[PDB]
Each structure stands twice: as structure tokens, then as C-alpha cells.
Amino acid sequence: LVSTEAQIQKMSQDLQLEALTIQSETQFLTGINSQAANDCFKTLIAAMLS
Amino acid sequence: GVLNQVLNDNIRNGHVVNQLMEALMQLSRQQFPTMPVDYKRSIQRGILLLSNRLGQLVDLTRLLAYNYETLMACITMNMQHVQTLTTEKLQLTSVTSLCMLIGNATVIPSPQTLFHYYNVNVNFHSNYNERINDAVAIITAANRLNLY
Amino acid sequence: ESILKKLEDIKPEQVKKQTKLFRIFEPRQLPVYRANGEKELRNRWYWKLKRDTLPDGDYDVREYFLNLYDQVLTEMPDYLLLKDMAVENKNSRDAGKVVDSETAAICDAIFQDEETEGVVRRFIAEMRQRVQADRNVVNYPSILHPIDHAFNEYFLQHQLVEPLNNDIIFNYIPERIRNDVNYILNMDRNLPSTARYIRPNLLQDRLNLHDNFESLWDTITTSNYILARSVVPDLKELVSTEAQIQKMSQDLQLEALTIQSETQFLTGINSQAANDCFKTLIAAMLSQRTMSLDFVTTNYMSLISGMWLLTVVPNDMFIRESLVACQLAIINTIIYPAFGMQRMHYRNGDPQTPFQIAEQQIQNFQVANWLHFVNNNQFRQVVIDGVLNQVLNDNIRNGHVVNQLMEALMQLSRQQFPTMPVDYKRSIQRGILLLSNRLGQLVDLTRLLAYNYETLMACITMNMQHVQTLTTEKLQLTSVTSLCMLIGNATVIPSPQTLFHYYNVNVNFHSNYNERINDAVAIITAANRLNLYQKKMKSIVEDFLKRLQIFDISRVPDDQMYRLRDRLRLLPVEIRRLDIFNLILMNMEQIERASDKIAQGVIIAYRDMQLERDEMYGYVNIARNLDGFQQINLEELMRTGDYAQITNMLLNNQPVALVGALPFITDSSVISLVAKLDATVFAQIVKLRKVDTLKPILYKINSDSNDFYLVANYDWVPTSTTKVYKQIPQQFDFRASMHMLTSNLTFTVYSDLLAFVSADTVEPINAVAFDNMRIMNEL
Amino acid sequence: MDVLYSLSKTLKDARDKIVEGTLYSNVSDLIQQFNQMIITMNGNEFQTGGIGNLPIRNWNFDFGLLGTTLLNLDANYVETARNTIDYFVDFVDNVCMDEMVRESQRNGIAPQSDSLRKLSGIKFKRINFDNSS
């Protein structure tokens, strides 16, 4: 999988969340990790199969 | 002889993701008439974050569809589609993780994994049918033996 | 700063010099055998790979040839002087010279060998160099294989050096610097007719990184901004901060016991801020980096300085939110209260800026005209001297916009402010008075800014693409006030040495960018044409970005690198690299077939076939071609892994030809051939379903075989059922391999042309602008 | 035909609307259309042919854009626009004449002059605007 650090930095730079007035600045990029990606893959395929 | 829930051929080859990209590329060019420009820029740059992974998302769609088909080949009972009482909760942050972190390493079910899945499905189906037979036999025997 | 160190540490281009002729083949002595397999007393010279290391498998062979392409690109020189390679030919009649030392070694070996024909010795004696000093040319004899000759001839005839003279060096300077009357250029050397130089590859951006690559473009623009800051001149003889603060205090009539807005007018007025503002503005415009406006709405002097800033700098140079905030503050603090208009209720996200609404809503001609100019003040995209540039409006360049702004301000001061307390009008009037007491200095400052901008823009080699950047550069409006209040009458213009250094850094970066693009494109195209379907190209783009030296590849995801790969894949290959790859593609089959480590296949026929007669093997079961046989591609078999067809053919004894780079066992035993061992090396394919272990038998039956008496005593022509699809080496013909390599007798290559130009500036008081008037005219 | 009509309509609108003293808001869209026409036509070489006594004429377009800085148009702006409009009107009139004097039996509805045939290329579609006649 793509490096989580590099993708996180890329997304943070592109989104510019800190510059906005969003009440949830930290929560935006939470949950972005390899474990979450694997969980999504498994959940989608397993739900479709079952 | 097994009912199967199959995907659109555009999902299987991942071509439809192009359309998705097309659509959201248009969303990156839109004006957002009355939106604050900073928030508008953030939305458009996120839209482009997803857009610029067109190749990765096509690969991901093809991989997911292929894995689904391969593991569905190992299903022996009809894939009946019903709306269940309780659901499986899918965090959209996990969807974002999958979309933004998938690379280009193909992973497919191992032949032994497919055989194990098929064996488990066959064992469960056979046990289901055998227990139905046992229950039916005992009920019919009790009724014909007049065990009121 | 580390960024400036990275950007200024780029060297122009590493010049490659060829020290020896490129070679893939060499002569080698081999024993030869008669038609009956008996060894001849004479040996024979054959062409053999110098580095025979070709791998097993067709895919591995294509990878080997991609690596060979990289090696040849590394070894291809920018220029070449054959006299450096020249060495004495001891057997030359005239004591001449040959290139390279390897040629001399071959000549010595051939001449000293007792088996060499006297005609070849005569030919070696005639081998000498011819010098044409009039034409500055020299021809040297060389012994080369035809492929080696092709490569070396391409290197010789496609060198990158061009003649250098004083006119070329002078024209290297940007045309706008030469056409500028404020700079006097000089030279103290006459470059000789034998001087050479290498042009930088200043092709414009073929990757269009300004479009859809926002992080990479942010990095590029940040580097450009840092460099531009480094080269922007410092302001000299600024008005003393203490004296200016005293004068401002006297004008504002500050009161001790009263709270006043005018007090804040003195906030952050110092020479450091003035220089910071000058550098920030010019560097942001040069690097086309978006700026952010930092100001406090309670400081009205910041708002008036912002009026000047918006008058001079096109509004596309500022992030929209900051520009809108500044304009709204100006409208609601100065303009509307002056004219008794109700405070504007501006909506965030409005399609129109506050100044556009005000322009529609203001009935005063001067203020409305200034507002309209500010609204429509844009850059002009102009291709000057082949480079895209962002040109300021001529009224900005000459400073007339300052007069228009001053007319607007004077109209504002005359207004009554009907709905405000008299002290509010007094404060606005005092701020306008502060700005207007320096009208001439503001005209001078605008002209100085424009002149410095265009002079430093003359030294930019890459297109100035006007696109909003991801991140901005913060500009404090107090710094603008400092620049407006402290600017003196001293004219500062970029030094000629500073201009040359800026231009050289830009040229180095542009050339490196283009050369790395060429390398990446060549590698990607070669991999595609070599059908390297298992090759992940992320590494190529990663190396490209690493060699650009301004990006941190750890921050670049894989998707971005693959988008870069897709963009690079659409570009044509550089002419020299493309031709080298064409040579390699043409000659790779022959290079591969010359290897003694692998065979091109194995024919499994189930009929006896007489072993071929070759002089350098004796009797050998070699197939020159796969004619009359069904072919199984071993690469496809290994890729798919389905052995049904091959198993069916092997079990049924169906004649076939397994095609693919294979290692083979050379066997010289006649008894082994009689035993039919070559036919027993294929059952393992059926047993294990693997062909990587396949290793056919190549029989080499001749008098060096221990049991050759069987061949000699029975008039028996050996036969085998299996053949090895393989080629025989090409004989080394000494006369046919001699080529006269031609090059220039001698020249000198120079690196930094601007090192030969000494430039100075006219007196700054007398420096003129584009309109022939002095840049700064205040007393 | 649509591109030629669009050129003529743009020039007529420029003549009618670019007048001394007029608000720029009265010509903003017209100025944008005129500048688009300038950009599209710039760098293109045209020839109106010599059928009959019509002189052979060569047309080059290297015109700068119209300004956008004046709140109200003045005499200098009008004079510059007049020069550009006069050249463009001459070009359009000559193209129209060259087309009117030509006819074909096979495809009479298609353009017959090389100028109008060149204007039928895709790159000139940008010039196209309101077709109200």
C-alpha cells in the first residue's frame, strides 16, 4: 500500500484544513491508514459475498 | 444451479471509474457560486485528490471485482438478497483509506484459500440439508406414529 | 536557507569525456577443425563478447539489454578528441598511432602470431594516422566489430560541442539586459577559432507541472521565490526611521490623554520591514507565487498602503480571501464612510469583489475610476525572447497609476463624511495626508519596483505560469507602509553580477530539468519497447524527482509519480538517445546470439539428424533456424504456468522447438552422443512442471574428444535427435574490421561563458527606465 | 458562414457600442468578445482571391487586445478601437465579396472562397457568437 505518511502529508497540503474554520480540524484525516484500508476491502467483499 | 449476485461488466473491468473521474473532474472546474473561496478550494482539491488516482482506482475496482467473482465461485447456497435486521457498519474513512492507499500490487485468493472456502461452504450446506432431512424424518415419524 | 543551498548547488551539466572506444566484442583465438572433425594446426580468430554475462530467459535478456542501453547512454560522450585515445602502433612502418589501446593490443597479438598471413602483417604495417591541420581533423585506424564501429561512429559524429566565439558569448546574455542602457558590458579576450561550448537544453516545460501537479508546482514556485528574494537588491539610503516617525507624529498631532486611531499608524515602521516588503513583492511576482495580505483593520494606514499596493500589484497575485478582506476594509473604512454611503454588507463567496460592487455603487468619478483600474489591473502574458513572461501595465511601469490613486485619495479627503464624527474624518484625512506627502516618492517607488521586476524577469528562462499556488507568502501591510514611508530617492537596480548569477542559476535548473526529463523518457520508452511487462516504473520517476534536487520524494505518493510517468510517456525521445536505442534494438539479436552462455532454444525432433560441420566445433548439433518445427515459447509457458501442451507433446513424442534463452551443457563425449543423453533432459519438465531447470546438451564432437576414434575409424557422421538452436561465431577479418575514425585534431571546451564578460552599471542617479526617464526623479 | 457572420456582428457591435464617454459596463461583454476575436484571428494569414477584377489581397492579424482600464471610454480608446475595427471590417468585406462572386454546381452551399473555407476550421469556432439575423 502507498506510504501512509506520504499520502497523509499530500492530503493535508492539498486540503489546507488548518487554514479553514472547520470546528473539527484534527478529525478530518483520522482513520486514514493501512489497517482501515484492509478493513474496508474485507468488509466490502465479505458483505457482497454474504 | 446456484443463484449468484453479479456485478455490471463495467464494474468488473473498472471502466466506469473513468466516468466517475470525468464527473468529479467537472466538479473540480465548477464555480460553486455562493461558496466561500477557501472552502471551495478545499473541496475542489479533495475532489482532485480522488480524481488524480484514476489509475489506482481502476486497478482497485478491477481487483475488488475479481476477488468477489473468485470467492463467489466457491459459494454453494443461493445468494439471496434480503435487507437484514442488523447491518455491517462501514466507516467512510476506511473507504478513503482504501481509495488513497491502494497501490498496484495484485492480491488474489490463494488456491488453498479458495479450496478451504469452498469446503467450508459445502460442509455447511451439506449439514444444513442433512439436518433438514433428520428433522423432517423425525417429525413425519412422530406424526405417523400418532405421538400427539 | 536550505532551499537556496539546494537550488544554487546545482551544477550546469557534467561533461562526459570518452577515454576508450566502446566495445562489446573482441577477437579471440579458437582451435578449428576439419570437415571430418580433425584439429587443424592453424587457429582462427573469432568475434566473442568481451563481457559474456547474458542471463537465462527471454525476459531476463530484454532486461539485460535495457541495462546495456543505460550503460551506453552513460558512456556516450559530449565530445571526443581521438588523439587522447591514440597509442603507438609498434608494428607500423611509419611509427604511426592507432585508437584505442585495445586496438593496439589486437594489432600486436595478430602481428606476433606465427599463424597470421603476411598480407595481414602488411596491412598492420600500413596502419597510421592522418592529420589535416588545415581542417583541424585527424583520422586514426581502429579495429572494431561492426556493432562497436556503429556505436563509436555515432558517438564521433553526434557530439554536443559547437564553436565558441566572442559574439556567441555576448549573445548568451539575455537580449533585454544587452538592450538595457543602464548596463555596460565588456570583454578582455578574443576566443580562438578552436574554442567550443555546450548549449544548455532550455526547452520549455514539457510536463506542464503548472497544470494539475499542485504540490510539485508549490515546491518549484517556493524555490523560485527563495532565489528571487536572494537576488532582489537591498534598498539603500532609506529615510531615517526615527526622523520619519517624528515627522509622522507631528503630522498626526498625537495626543497623550486621548485614545486615537492615528497612533496605530506608527505601528511596524522600520527599514527591515521596508526591505522585506520590497523583496517579497518582487520575488512573488518573479516566481509567480501567490501572496497573502496580513493586516489589522484598526490600522487605517495599513488600509491606505493597501490601496497603493492594490493599485500597483495585479490582484491575481493575492489569495482571494485576503484580497477580499483588504478591499472590504478599505471600502467600509475609507470609501463608503467618506461619501455617506451605508456600510457594505458583503457576502463571503460573492462572485464580485468589494471593489467591483463599490465601483458600481460610487458616483465620484476619480474614486470610481481608480476602483475600475484596480478591478481590471491584470498581468499581460507575453512571450519575450522565447520565454513566457507576466508584464505589468505600462501605467504601472511609468508610475502614472500613482497619480490616479492620488487623485482618488484627494477626492476622498474633500468629502464631508456626513454620518461619522468629525474625528473619524480627521483620522482618515491624516492617513491620506501621510500617504500624499510622499507622492513623488511613491511614483519613484512604483517605477523602481517595475524596473527591478522587469530587469530580473529578463533573467528567467522558464515560462512564468500565472496559477494560484497551494501555499502563499505572507505580506504584512505594515511592511507596505514602511516601504511607502521610508523609501528615499536612491535608485537601486540589480547588479550585473547579480543578474548573471540569477540567470545562471535559472539556466542550470532548466537544463537539469530538461536533461532529467530526457533520461526518464528514454528509459520509459526503452522499457516499453523491450516489453518489460513485469517492470514497475515508480523507480524511474523516483530517480527523476531525486535528481531534480528540489523535491522531497518521501512526500510524493506513488500515484503522483505514476501520473508523472504517464506524462513522460507521451513525450518524444531525445534524438541522440533515440538513435542509440535504435542501434541497440537493431543489434540486440546479434549481440545475444554471440553469447556462449545461453542458447536460443532446443529442437526436440525424434528422428536422427546428422550433426552439423562447423570449423570451430567439429561436429555440433546446432540448429541455425527453427524451420519445420512447432514452437513453444518458454517465456509464455513460465508466465502462464500451464504445462498441458508441453506435457502432451513430450509424452507423445511430437517434434517441437522450445524457444527461449536457455543455458546448455557442452559435451564432447562421443559415447554420450551414442547413448542419446541429449534426449533424456526433458522428462523433468513433465515431472516437475518447471522449465527454468531445463538445460539441453550441445555436442562438440572432434579430435579433442577421447572417443573420436569411433568417428575416424567408421566413416561415421554423428547423428542426434535433439538440436540446440544456436548460432556460430563470426570470423574475425582483420582487414574488414579496420575503420578510420575521424575527429577534430584539438579544441578547448569552455563552461561559463559569462565568466568572459565583465559588466558594470551606470551611476544609479542616472539610471533610466523603459520610457527613457530616470527611474527615481525626486530631489 | 456562422464564423464570418460572427466577425461581422462583432465589428458592427464594436462600431455601435464603442463610443466616446460610454460606460465600460456597456461594453464589457462586447470587449471580451472582440478580444476573443483578436486572439483567434491573430497569427493567421488569409488571402482573398483574384477572380474577375477583384484584387488579390493578403491579410495578416497581429493586433493587441482592447483595453479594460477606463471606467468610461475616451477618445484615445475609441481611436485605437477604430483602427483595429477598420482593418477587420476591410478584411470581412473583402472576404464577403470574394465569396459572393463564386459558385459551384456540386456543393453550392459549402464555402467557395479559400478564406471562408479556412474560417470553417475548428480553431475559429471560438469567434462564433449571437446569430440573431
Side-chain angles (χ1 to χ4, degrees), chain C residues 587-625:
Chain C
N587 301 124
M588 60 186 281
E589 188 233 36
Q590 204 185 321
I591 289 158
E592 187 214 338
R593 272 145 193 244
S595 158
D596 287 334
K597 281 166 55 47
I598 50 164
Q600 277 59 61
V602 60
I603 287 163
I604 316 170
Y606 297 84
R607 54 186 174 82
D608 308 334
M609 306 177 292
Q610 72 188 111
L611 267 62
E612 198 180 60
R613 295 184 179 92
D614 288 294
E615 58 176 346
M616 80 300 292
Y617 290 116
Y619 286 110
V620 71
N621 61 317
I622 278 180
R624 309 289 193 89
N625 52 75

Short mmCIF file of all heavy atoms in Angstrom, two decimals, chain C residues 587-625:
data_model
loop_
_atom_site.label_atom_id
_atom_site.label_comp_id
_atom_site.label_asym_id
_atom_site.label_seq_id
_atom_site.Cartn_x
_atom_site.Cartn_y
_atom_site.Cartn_z
N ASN C 587 20.70 -4.32 -33.13
CA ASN C 587 21.82 -5.23 -32.95
C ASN C 587 21.69 -6.15 -31.74
O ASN C 587 22.62 -6.92 -31.47
CB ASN C 587 23.12 -4.43 -32.83
CG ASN C 587 23.37 -3.57 -34.05
OD1 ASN C 587 23.54 -2.36 -33.94
ND2 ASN C 587 23.42 -4.20 -35.21
N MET C 588 20.58 -6.10 -31.00
CA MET C 588 20.48 -6.89 -29.78
C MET C 588 20.34 -8.37 -30.08
O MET C 588 20.85 -9.20 -29.32
CB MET C 588 19.30 -6.43 -28.93
CG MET C 588 17.95 -6.51 -29.60
SD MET C 588 16.66 -5.77 -28.61
CE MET C 588 16.35 -7.08 -27.44
N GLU C 589 19.64 -8.73 -31.16
CA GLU C 589 19.55 -10.14 -31.52
C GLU C 589 20.93 -10.71 -31.82
O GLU C 589 21.27 -11.81 -31.36
CB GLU C 589 18.62 -10.29 -32.73
CG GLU C 589 18.27 -11.72 -33.10
CD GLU C 589 18.56 -12.04 -34.56
OE1 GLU C 589 19.55 -11.52 -35.11
OE2 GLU C 589 17.77 -12.80 -35.16
N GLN C 590 21.75 -9.97 -32.56
CA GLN C 590 23.09 -10.43 -32.88
C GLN C 590 23.99 -10.44 -31.65
O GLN C 590 24.85 -11.31 -31.51
CB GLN C 590 23.68 -9.55 -33.98
CG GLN C 590 24.76 -10.23 -34.78
CD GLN C 590 25.40 -9.30 -35.78
OE1 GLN C 590 24.73 -8.47 -36.40
NE2 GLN C 590 26.71 -9.43 -35.96
N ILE C 591 23.81 -9.47 -30.75
CA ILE C 591 24.59 -9.46 -29.51
C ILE C 591 24.25 -10.67 -28.66
O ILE C 591 25.14 -11.34 -28.12
CB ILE C 591 24.35 -8.15 -28.73
CG1 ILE C 591 25.01 -6.97 -29.45
CG2 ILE C 591 24.89 -8.26 -27.32
CD1 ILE C 591 24.41 -5.63 -29.09
N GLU C 592 22.96 -10.98 -28.53
CA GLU C 592 22.53 -12.12 -27.74
C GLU C 592 23.04 -13.42 -28.35
O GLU C 592 23.53 -14.30 -27.65
CB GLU C 592 21.01 -12.14 -27.65
CG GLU C 592 20.45 -13.19 -26.70
CD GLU C 592 19.12 -13.75 -27.18
OE1 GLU C 592 18.44 -13.08 -27.98
OE2 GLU C 592 18.76 -14.87 -26.75
N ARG C 593 22.91 -13.56 -29.67
CA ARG C 593 23.30 -14.80 -30.32
C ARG C 593 24.81 -15.03 -30.28
O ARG C 593 25.26 -16.14 -30.57
CB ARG C 593 22.79 -14.81 -31.76
CG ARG C 593 21.39 -15.35 -31.87
CD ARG C 593 20.57 -14.66 -32.93
NE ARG C 593 19.16 -15.00 -32.79
CZ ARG C 593 18.43 -15.66 -33.68
NH1 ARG C 593 18.94 -16.07 -34.84
NH2 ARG C 593 17.16 -15.93 -33.40
N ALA C 594 25.59 -14.01 -29.93
CA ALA C 594 27.03 -14.16 -29.81
C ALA C 594 27.46 -14.71 -28.46
O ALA C 594 28.65 -14.97 -28.26
CB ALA C 594 27.72 -12.81 -30.04
N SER C 595 26.53 -14.89 -27.52
CA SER C 595 26.88 -15.34 -26.19
C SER C 595 27.12 -16.84 -26.17
O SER C 595 26.41 -17.61 -26.83
CB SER C 595 25.77 -14.98 -25.20
OG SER C 595 25.82 -15.80 -24.05
N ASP C 596 28.13 -17.26 -25.42
CA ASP C 596 28.44 -18.67 -25.22
C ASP C 596 27.78 -19.25 -23.98
O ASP C 596 27.95 -20.44 -23.71
CB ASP C 596 29.96 -18.86 -25.12
CG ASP C 596 30.66 -18.70 -26.45
OD1 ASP C 596 30.01 -18.92 -27.49
OD2 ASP C 596 31.85 -18.35 -26.44
N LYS C 597 27.03 -18.45 -23.23
CA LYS C 597 26.39 -18.92 -22.01
C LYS C 597 24.98 -19.44 -22.24
O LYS C 597 24.55 -20.34 -21.52
CB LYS C 597 26.35 -17.80 -20.97
CG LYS C 597 27.67 -17.58 -20.24
CD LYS C 597 27.67 -16.27 -19.48
CE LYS C 597 26.50 -16.17 -18.50
NZ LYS C 597 26.33 -17.40 -17.69
N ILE C 598 24.26 -18.88 -23.21
CA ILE C 598 22.88 -19.26 -23.45
C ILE C 598 22.71 -19.67 -24.90
O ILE C 598 23.47 -19.25 -25.78
CB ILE C 598 21.90 -18.12 -23.10
CG1 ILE C 598 22.33 -16.81 -23.76
CG2 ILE C 598 21.80 -17.95 -21.60
CD1 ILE C 598 21.25 -15.77 -23.80
N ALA C 599 21.71 -20.50 -25.15
CA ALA C 599 21.28 -20.88 -26.49
C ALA C 599 19.91 -20.28 -26.77
O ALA C 599 19.14 -19.98 -25.85
CB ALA C 599 21.24 -22.40 -26.65
N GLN C 600 19.61 -20.12 -28.05
CA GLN C 600 18.34 -19.54 -28.45
C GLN C 600 17.19 -20.53 -28.41
O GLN C 600 16.04 -20.12 -28.53
CB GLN C 600 18.46 -18.94 -29.85
CG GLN C 600 19.06 -17.55 -29.86
CD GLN C 600 20.44 -17.51 -29.26
OE1 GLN C 600 21.37 -18.15 -29.74
NE2 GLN C 600 20.59 -16.76 -28.17
N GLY C 601 17.47 -21.82 -28.24
CA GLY C 601 16.40 -22.76 -27.98
C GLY C 601 16.90 -24.19 -28.09
O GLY C 601 18.10 -24.44 -28.18
N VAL C 602 15.95 -25.12 -28.10
CA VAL C 602 16.26 -26.53 -28.29
C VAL C 602 15.17 -27.16 -29.14
O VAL C 602 13.98 -27.06 -28.82
CB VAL C 602 16.41 -27.28 -26.95
CG1 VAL C 602 15.14 -27.21 -26.13
CG2 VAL C 602 16.83 -28.72 -27.19
N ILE C 603 15.57 -27.81 -30.23
CA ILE C 603 14.65 -28.54 -31.09
C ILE C 603 14.65 -30.00 -30.65
O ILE C 603 15.68 -30.68 -30.72
CB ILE C 603 15.06 -28.42 -32.57
CG1 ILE C 603 14.74 -27.02 -33.09
CG2 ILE C 603 14.35 -29.47 -33.40
CD1 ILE C 603 15.46 -26.69 -34.38
N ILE C 604 13.49 -30.47 -30.20
CA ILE C 604 13.30 -31.87 -29.83
C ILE C 604 12.62 -32.51 -31.04
O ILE C 604 11.40 -32.48 -31.20
CB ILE C 604 12.46 -32.02 -28.56
CG1 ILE C 604 12.91 -31.04 -27.48
CG2 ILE C 604 12.57 -33.44 -28.04
CD1 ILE C 604 11.97 -30.98 -26.31
N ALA C 605 13.44 -33.07 -31.93
CA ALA C 605 12.97 -33.92 -33.01
C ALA C 605 13.27 -35.36 -32.63
O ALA C 605 14.22 -35.65 -31.91
CB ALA C 605 13.66 -33.57 -34.33
N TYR C 606 12.42 -36.27 -33.10
CA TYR C 606 12.53 -37.68 -32.77
C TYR C 606 12.97 -38.49 -33.98
O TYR C 606 12.55 -39.63 -34.18
CB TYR C 606 11.21 -38.18 -32.19
CG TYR C 606 10.86 -37.48 -30.90
CD1 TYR C 606 10.21 -36.26 -30.91
CD2 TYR C 606 11.20 -38.03 -29.68
CE1 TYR C 606 9.90 -35.61 -29.74
CE2 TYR C 606 10.90 -37.38 -28.50
CZ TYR C 606 10.25 -36.17 -28.54
OH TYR C 606 9.94 -35.53 -27.37
N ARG C 607 13.83 -37.89 -34.80
CA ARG C 607 14.48 -38.56 -35.90
C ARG C 607 15.96 -38.21 -35.86
O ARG C 607 16.35 -37.13 -35.39
CB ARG C 607 13.90 -38.14 -37.25
CG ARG C 607 13.89 -36.64 -37.48
CD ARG C 607 13.17 -36.28 -38.76
NE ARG C 607 13.04 -34.84 -38.92
CZ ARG C 607 14.00 -34.05 -39.40
NH1 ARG C 607 15.17 -34.52 -39.77
NH2 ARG C 607 13.76 -32.74 -39.51
N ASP C 608 16.79 -39.13 -36.34
CA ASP C 608 18.23 -38.88 -36.37
C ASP C 608 18.55 -37.79 -37.37
O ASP C 608 18.08 -37.81 -38.51
CB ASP C 608 18.97 -40.16 -36.72
CG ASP C 608 18.57 -41.33 -35.85
OD1 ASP C 608 18.12 -41.09 -34.71
OD2 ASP C 608 18.69 -42.49 -36.31
N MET C 609 19.35 -36.81 -36.94
CA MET C 609 19.77 -35.70 -37.78
C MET C 609 21.27 -35.55 -37.67
O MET C 609 21.81 -35.43 -36.57
CB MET C 609 19.06 -34.41 -37.37
CG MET C 609 17.55 -34.52 -37.32
SD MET C 609 16.74 -33.03 -36.73
CE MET C 609 17.27 -33.02 -35.03
N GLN C 610 21.95 -35.56 -38.82
CA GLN C 610 23.40 -35.51 -38.82
C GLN C 610 23.90 -34.23 -38.18
O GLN C 610 23.39 -33.14 -38.45
CB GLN C 610 23.92 -35.62 -40.26
CG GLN C 610 23.70 -34.39 -41.10
CD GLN C 610 24.04 -34.61 -42.56
OE1 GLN C 610 23.16 -34.63 -43.41
NE2 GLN C 610 25.33 -34.80 -42.84
N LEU C 611 24.90 -34.36 -37.31
CA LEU C 611 25.47 -33.19 -36.66
C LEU C 611 26.12 -32.28 -37.70
O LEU C 611 26.80 -32.74 -38.62
CB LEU C 611 26.51 -33.62 -35.62
CG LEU C 611 25.97 -33.79 -34.20
CD1 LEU C 611 24.93 -34.88 -34.13
CD2 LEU C 611 27.10 -34.08 -33.23
N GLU C 612 25.88 -30.98 -37.55
CA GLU C 612 26.42 -30.01 -38.48
C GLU C 612 27.94 -29.94 -38.40
O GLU C 612 28.53 -30.08 -37.33
CB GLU C 612 25.82 -28.63 -38.21
CG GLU C 612 25.96 -27.66 -39.36
CD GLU C 612 25.36 -26.31 -39.04
OE1 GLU C 612 25.82 -25.67 -38.08
OE2 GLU C 612 24.42 -25.89 -39.75
N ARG C 613 28.56 -29.71 -39.55
CA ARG C 613 30.00 -29.49 -39.62
C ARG C 613 30.28 -28.00 -39.50
O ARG C 613 29.84 -27.21 -40.34
CB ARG C 613 30.58 -30.02 -40.93
CG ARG C 613 30.48 -31.51 -41.10
CD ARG C 613 31.16 -31.96 -42.38
NE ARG C 613 31.09 -33.40 -42.56
CZ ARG C 613 30.13 -34.04 -43.22
NH1 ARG C 613 29.13 -33.39 -43.79
NH2 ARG C 613 30.17 -35.37 -43.30
N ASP C 614 31.01 -27.61 -38.46
CA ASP C 614 31.49 -26.25 -38.31
C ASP C 614 32.96 -26.31 -37.96
O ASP C 614 33.41 -27.25 -37.30
CB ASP C 614 30.70 -25.49 -37.25
CG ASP C 614 29.30 -25.14 -37.70
OD1 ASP C 614 29.16 -24.34 -38.65
OD2 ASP C 614 28.33 -25.66 -37.11
N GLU C 615 33.73 -25.32 -38.41
CA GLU C 615 35.18 -25.40 -38.23
C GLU C 615 35.58 -25.23 -36.77
O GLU C 615 36.55 -25.84 -36.33
CB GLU C 615 35.89 -24.37 -39.11
CG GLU C 615 35.49 -22.94 -38.85
CD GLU C 615 36.28 -21.97 -39.68
OE1 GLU C 615 37.31 -22.37 -40.26
OE2 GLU C 615 35.88 -20.79 -39.75
N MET C 616 34.85 -24.41 -36.02
CA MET C 616 35.21 -24.10 -34.64
C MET C 616 34.55 -25.03 -33.63
O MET C 616 34.66 -24.78 -32.42
CB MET C 616 34.89 -22.64 -34.33
CG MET C 616 33.43 -22.33 -34.01
SD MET C 616 32.30 -22.72 -35.35
CE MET C 616 32.76 -21.50 -36.57
N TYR C 617 33.85 -26.07 -34.08
CA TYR C 617 33.25 -27.05 -33.18
C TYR C 617 33.61 -28.47 -33.59
O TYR C 617 33.69 -29.36 -32.74
CB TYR C 617 31.73 -26.90 -33.15
CG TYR C 617 31.22 -25.66 -32.47
CD1 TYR C 617 30.53 -24.69 -33.18
CD2 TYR C 617 31.43 -25.45 -31.12
CE1 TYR C 617 30.06 -23.56 -32.57
CE2 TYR C 617 30.97 -24.31 -30.50
CZ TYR C 617 30.28 -23.37 -31.23
OH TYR C 617 29.82 -22.23 -30.61
N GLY C 618 33.85 -28.67 -34.87
CA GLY C 618 33.90 -30.02 -35.44
C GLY C 618 32.51 -30.45 -35.89
O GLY C 618 31.93 -29.85 -36.79
N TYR C 619 31.99 -31.50 -35.26
CA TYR C 619 30.59 -31.88 -35.39
C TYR C 619 29.82 -31.31 -34.20
O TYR C 619 30.23 -31.51 -33.05
CB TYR C 619 30.43 -33.40 -35.43
CG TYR C 619 30.85 -34.04 -36.72
CD1 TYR C 619 32.00 -34.82 -36.79
CD2 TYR C 619 30.10 -33.88 -37.88
CE1 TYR C 619 32.38 -35.42 -37.97
CE2 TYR C 619 30.48 -34.48 -39.06
CZ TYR C 619 31.62 -35.25 -39.10
OH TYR C 619 32.00 -35.84 -40.27
N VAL C 620 28.73 -30.60 -34.48
CA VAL C 620 27.95 -29.95 -33.44
C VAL C 620 26.48 -30.01 -33.82
O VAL C 620 26.11 -29.74 -34.97
CB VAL C 620 28.40 -28.49 -33.23
CG1 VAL C 620 28.00 -27.62 -34.40
CG2 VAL C 620 27.86 -27.94 -31.92
N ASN C 621 25.63 -30.36 -32.85
CA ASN C 621 24.19 -30.44 -33.07
C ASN C 621 23.54 -29.07 -32.91
O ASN C 621 22.73 -28.82 -32.02
CB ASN C 621 23.58 -31.46 -32.12
CG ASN C 621 23.77 -31.09 -30.66
OD1 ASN C 621 24.85 -30.65 -30.26
ND2 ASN C 621 22.73 -31.28 -29.86
N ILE C 622 23.89 -28.17 -33.82
CA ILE C 622 23.42 -26.79 -33.80
C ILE C 622 22.37 -26.62 -34.88
O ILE C 622 22.55 -27.06 -36.02
CB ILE C 622 24.59 -25.80 -34.01
CG1 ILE C 622 25.31 -25.58 -32.68
CG2 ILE C 622 24.08 -24.48 -34.60
CD1 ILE C 622 26.49 -24.63 -32.74
N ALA C 623 21.26 -25.97 -34.52
CA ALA C 623 20.23 -25.57 -35.46
C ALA C 623 20.41 -24.10 -35.78
O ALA C 623 20.37 -23.26 -34.87
CB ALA C 623 18.84 -25.83 -34.89
N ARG C 624 20.61 -23.78 -37.05
CA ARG C 624 20.71 -22.39 -37.46
C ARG C 624 19.36 -21.69 -37.48
O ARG C 624 19.31 -20.46 -37.40
CB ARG C 624 21.34 -22.29 -38.85
CG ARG C 624 22.65 -23.05 -39.02
CD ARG C 624 23.79 -22.41 -38.26
NE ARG C 624 25.08 -22.97 -38.66
CZ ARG C 624 25.83 -22.51 -39.66
NH1 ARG C 624 25.45 -21.47 -40.39
NH2 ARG C 624 26.98 -23.11 -39.93
N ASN C 625 18.27 -22.45 -37.58
CA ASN C 625 16.93 -21.88 -37.62
C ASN C 625 15.93 -22.92 -37.13
O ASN C 625 16.21 -24.12 -37.13
CB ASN C 625 16.57 -21.41 -39.03
CG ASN C 625 16.79 -22.49 -40.07
OD1 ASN C 625 16.00 -23.43 -40.17
ND2 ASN C 625 17.86 -22.37 -40.84
#
